[PDB]
Design goal:
Chains A, D, F: hemagglutinin
Largest sheet of chain B: 7 strands, mixed
Strand content of chain A: 5-15%
PDB class: viral protein
Order of helices and strands of chain A: EEHHEEHH
Strand order of the largest sheet of chain A: 1-2
Entry title: The structure of hemagglutinin L226Q mutant from a avian-origin H7N9 influenza virus (A/Anhui/1/2013)
Number of domains of chain B: 2
Assembly: hexameric
Number of strands of chain A: 4
Oligomer: heterohexamer
Number of strands of chain B: 27
Structural class of chain B: mainly beta
Order of helices and strands of chain B: EEEEEEEHEEHEEEEHEEEEEEEEEEEEEE
CATH topology of chain A: Hemagglutinin Ectodomain, Chain B
Bound molecules: 2-acetamido-2-deoxy-beta-D-glucopyranose
Shape of chain A: rod-shaped
CATH architecture of the largest domain in chain B: Alpha-Beta Complex
Largest interface: A-B, 70 and 61 residues
CATH topology of the largest domain in chain B: Hemagglutinin (Ha1 Chain), Chain: A, domain 1
Keywords: homotrimer, membrane fusion, Viral Protein
Radius of gyration of chain B: 28 Å
Chain lengths: 168, 314, 314, 168, 314, 168
């Protein structure tokens, strides 16, 4: 686990219906909230990969070894049942472990993608802002909405906005 | 600027390596619980035996008259089926059944046995057709007269085919030593059978069995697979049911047992007695004895696979 | 300000996906090695057969006299047990044993056979009671006089019960054709047996077997399960041991084989020959043939599960 | 692995017996060392979850298929043994893998919780301190012990302590 | 200052929990596909039976003459092998084969049977040596004269050894009741066999079988394991082949079936019909019926294990 | 996943043949590129650990249960085949899962070691440099090649180089 989702971020946005990860800011011009494709997509394209790997086609045919209309002889009947019950124990075991293991990874994967989104925006604003500590960033140069848009699509000049926030 | 993640009011609880009931945004089922109560047989040469028993297709009681030379990708045994008109049964019946299920059907062929001064049209009211008949692929060999005697015979057949031949003969066990002699004459009767592979021999055993189909006599059915260019010989002297035709397996098939209807409207490859399991899920909790190409049976009813992140509502 | 983590001087080595002997703060065992050398049978209707053999409970040699109609949740076979007084044995003995282990005990019932002018009190010094007796649930049918002859008989019984009946008869094989005739008269003796299900027949085979219990004769024990409303018939003429009572299974139970004592002070659900495995661990390295509700047997003696972090001492 | 425990942190405190993760500082007032509940607890409540998931009750009874007093016929005897040995191979395999896989995760989980503790204190002192690089923090405003206590219970004003450490 | 990681132009695609064909720097194979087409038998006492059949080592037809008392760590059955000179076969042949494969070889021992006024040098042109012989470890017991009669005999042997004895006898089935009497005289012939463990009996069954080795007679071979200090008895009167020597198992071995050559130049512990699987890989896709100490068979041809990081070329 | 390899780092150095992780800088004195032992080694000593754990010797012998020259009886023959096919399904399943699971971990392990290397150099230069955001670091005091060498072997005085880069 990476510490973002259900970590220092208190919760999520039940109004964010555009993606998994997004930006909700607060500058003078009013209000806005958007979604990030590439983060959302990289989580989508990975959970989707897990599913496509678990839905398969065992070209492995199995035939009747037993008879329900005419019970086979007891000794062989009991060996078969004993054997079938043994294989069932394995598959029930495998299935439960597989799902638990996968779910753990799926969840820590979504955390990862958040923390990866965060700690990249943080690096995009080399010092023109600082970390509040709840997933929010305080700029010290009043960013506009062609500036917030400039961040979201990764352009923001990492220098040409400096002292205006540095000196302050 | 601030960043967070999506969420929902209503989440779905999953299990993890560490937790048990963590809510995620979205999960999906991993265990199939859905059954379709028909035999989805779309695209397959299917044979529903109904009242014919799979083993009867070899010997030929009247139920099996239309199944003596069938061809199949999928074979269905029914509960109402019967391998028998005249009461009796097969030795190693299930082994034989398993062979027949994946035979792809059967081709019949004259073994070409000829008989020298005995009777040959043995019959009964248990095998009803026009009147009192017998098994279509067999011959009830009798002493020539209504008591008479049986001349220790010898008949043999060679598999001059490229495939193994299914050979089937019967031993008759009468109500008594009385009837055993009226039919075959007196003396302990002995039948021997061999090949470049096989080794056995048989004696009858008259006596009163309870009445089945209205009869107290029985017929022991026995069988052996002859190899290409191997020969099989029948040293016999009575209490004997002769194979008229031999059987060859057509190719490959699947055999199941069911009590539900057939549907050529749905495609299935995983079958059980109650219908078809159509799923792409890796597992299933419907029938542990499901056959064909199936998801693995598991004891669990449900195992939810996370397809999303933690759902943390406000 | 500075932050670190806890540690200890003495850590516990574990294995990982990548390492082998990494020390953690605390680990816990995952494989059960602890056995309790008693049959923990607290709360269960238990039956220790001691010298009675499980199959003897059906036929009734003297060891089994107090086990003819038992009732159980748990059945214990002992090494000193014996299914037999008069030397002999069962055909498909283990199949029958497996049936009896999970029967939940047995209820006995008169089959109600009556005999017409023969002997009926066959006995021996092998089955000792007051004097020379026989199997309690069986009848040693004899030719009426000290040589005499045996009238080819017929007896039949119908399972008018809702549950399948366990039917058991015996075939006697004497020291010689001499003794075979003194007991049953001359001629090849034949016994046939059938149902709406079953098909078999039997001939004796006198001769000298080595001496067991002081006897050179044997008794072949055979058995069949009759269905509700199905009938079973015995065409016989000698060398025959008649079933007096039939058997019905009470419900469900567990059967084990052990040489250790019983303790109603401990509760167990996983048993082996050397005692009870009481554990909640997912695995065990005690007995691969442990039965009941058990952890899975593994070849490994120990598998330590990490319950803490890396132990990094200074 | 996250890099904290047995990473840049040289080792652990065999005297820390109050928890798994804690604070040991150095200001003028003498000395003190404490433990953090919530970090320690979140690691405890997770390892504890693993154990409760591995101790179970297979309501799956298995019956005798063999006989030790009276050996069953050889052919069937050998099929049974062969089959039982095959199932043993699987369970021995499953058990070894399960334990290795779990131990790996358990250990990287404890690392995670440390790094998550660290990189949250680091965010609580937005600039009133800097990272030495060995898990220790240098404040530039002489924090007191109702101030160190203020950090430990997450209160520390992320501003009202500033310039006193900023200017320096 | 800047930091990155290594890479390559040509990477290796692997599969992951989430992806399928991600290129890594370096991967390694996990499934063995490499076979060595020889029996790597370096360091092992090996016995290649060639034309001798494993069961023939007990009875001793001429092919097995040099295998009557062999000793082995590794036993190889060949396709050209044969358990038989005079046509016939064993009852429970494969059980017996499995016992012999892990016997570690066999030690032979005189059972010490002596015969009173009968013939004893029964032979045939099927077992050719100097002239017309028989099985080396057996005795073809005959009625004294060229028709004559057979005196119902009794012979017995006691395992005065610490190990179980393999006992083997044969029942002869002739071309007819004609030849059956010339050899043994008339009347239904009966052989009985018992121990403190065993219970069976036998009757011949003359008749015409097809001609194998130039003969239409057969020999039924039967067998039982006698215990230390247990006794075995043969009540017999004809149609009988007598055991001369009994057999004891030497220790432990492995048995395989192959059609490839032996090499004492290579070491192997995992064998199949086409050679030796020498690998340290956890899995293999060569033969599912591979035996010895082998990697697990898997259906997959290849499973590449990542031994490096993501390969991201510029 | 940690976000370094195939994350903000666009790609890798097909010329870096000295190790897995290394330094390539840019100061006045010309050019140089080196490899880091300890990072590279800790990834090597861990993948190597995985392999040594997957190559084993099951001292578990299995014997013939079947016959190829003389086919055993059909019923028992079919039970054996049915059973063998069932065990094959398990091992094929286990093998595919094991390899996928391991490969996932192997790859996220290499990421981890990079991010661990990075975020330690970053801590070694307490403020005498700042993060560009593509895995590269901008010093503000023109580091020399006995200074770059000083970083690579972890010595760099975290103070005695300060203001020369701080003031700038
Ligand atoms: C085997 O299991 C089936 C159900 O799966 C059961 O109906 C049957 O009675 C069992 N066979 C024997 C021999 O007990
Ligand atoms: C829920 O999960 C399934 C995964 O199979 C997916 O098809 C469905 O769209 C998901 N719903 C949403 C909106 O997340
Ligand atoms: C099978 O039949 C052909 C045609 O008669 C014959 O040439 C061939 O030799 C036979 N196969 C054997 C067993 O030799
Ligand atoms: C060691 O591990 C076991 C886990 O079952 C736990 O009960 C015990 O308290 C642990 N000891 C300590 C103090 O960590
Ligand atoms: C079983 O017994 C009852 C009572 O005699 C009878 O009515 C019923 O028909 C029987 N079952 C069968 C096989 O029909
Ligand atoms: C099967 O295994 C047991 C021990 O688990 C052994 O004692 C027995 O001899 C084996 N059975 C056969 C038929 O070899
Ligand atoms: C590729 O992988 C194998 C792992 O067994 C290793 O022996 C080989 O040296 C590797 N090649 C390189 C140079 O990475
Ligand atoms: C086996 O042989 C020895 C030597 O004759 C004998 O003392 C011992 O009692 C025998 N074992 C049995 C079954 O008692
Ligand atoms: C069992 O499988 C083998 C191949 O693995 C096959 O050749 C054989 O015919 C099968 N046995 C039966 C009884 O069908």
């Amino acid at each position: 686990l990476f510490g973002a989702i259900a970590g220092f971020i208190e919760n999520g946005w039940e109004g964010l219906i555009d993606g998994w990860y997004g930006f909700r800011h607060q500058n003078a011009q009013g209000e806005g909230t958007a979604a990030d494709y590439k983060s959302t997509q990289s989580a989508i394209d990975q959970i989707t990969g897990k599913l496509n790997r678990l839905i398969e086609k065992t070209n492995q045919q199995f035939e009747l070894i037993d008879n329900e209309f005419n019970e086979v002889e007891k000794q062989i009947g009991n060996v078969i049942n004993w054997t079938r019950d043994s294989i069932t124990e394995v598959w029930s075991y495998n299935a439960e472990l597989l799902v638990a293991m996968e779910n753990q990874h799926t969840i820590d994967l979504a955390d990862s993608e958040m923390d990866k989104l965060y700690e990249r925006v943080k690096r995009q604003l080399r010092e023109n802002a600082e970390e509040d500590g709840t997933g929010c960033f305080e700029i010290f140069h009043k960013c506009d909405d062609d500036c917030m848009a400039s961040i979201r699509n990764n352009t923001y000049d990492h220098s040409k906005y400096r002292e205006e926030a540095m000196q302050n | 600027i601030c960043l967070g993640h999506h969420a929902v009011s209503n989440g779905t609880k999953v299990n993890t390596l560490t937790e048990r009931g963590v809510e995620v945004v979205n999960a999906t089922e991993t265990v199939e619980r859905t059954n379709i109560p028909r035999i989805c047989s779309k695209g397959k040469r299917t044979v529903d035996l109904g009242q014919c028993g799979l083993l009867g297709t070899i010997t030929g009681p009247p139920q099996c008259d239309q199944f003596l030379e069938f061809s199949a990708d999928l074979i269905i045994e029914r509960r109402e089926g019967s391998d028998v008109c005249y009461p009796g049964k097969f030795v190693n019946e299930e082994a034989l059944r398993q062979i027949l299920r994946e035979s792809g059907g059967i081709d019949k062929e004259a073994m070409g046995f000829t008989y020298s001064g005995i009777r040959t049209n043995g019959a009964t009211s248990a095998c009803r057709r026009s009147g009192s008949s017998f098994y279509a692929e067999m011959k009830w060999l009798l002493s020539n007269t209504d008591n008479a005697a049986f001349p220790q015979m010898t008949k043999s057949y060679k598999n001059t085919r490229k495939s193994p031949a299914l050979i089937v003969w019967g031993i008759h066990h009468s109500v008594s030593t009385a009837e055993q002699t009226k039919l075959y004459g007196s003396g302990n009767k002995l039948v021997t059978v061999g090949s470049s592979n096989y080794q056995q021999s048989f004696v009858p055993s008259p006596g009163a069995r309870p009445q089945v189909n209205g009869q107290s006599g029985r017929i022991d059915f026995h069988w052996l697979m002859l190899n290409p260019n191997d020969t099989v010989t029948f040293s016999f002297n009575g209490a004997f049911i002769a194979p008229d035709r031999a059987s060859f397996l057509r190719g490959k098939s699947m055999g199941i047992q069911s009590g539900v209807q057939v549907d050529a409207n749905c495609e299935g490859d995983c079958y059980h007695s109650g219908g078809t399991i159509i799923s792409n899920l890796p597992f299933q909790n419907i029938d542990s004895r499901a056959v064909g190409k199936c998801p693995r049976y598991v004891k669990q009813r449900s195992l939810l696979l996370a397809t999303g992140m933690k759902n943390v509502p406000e």
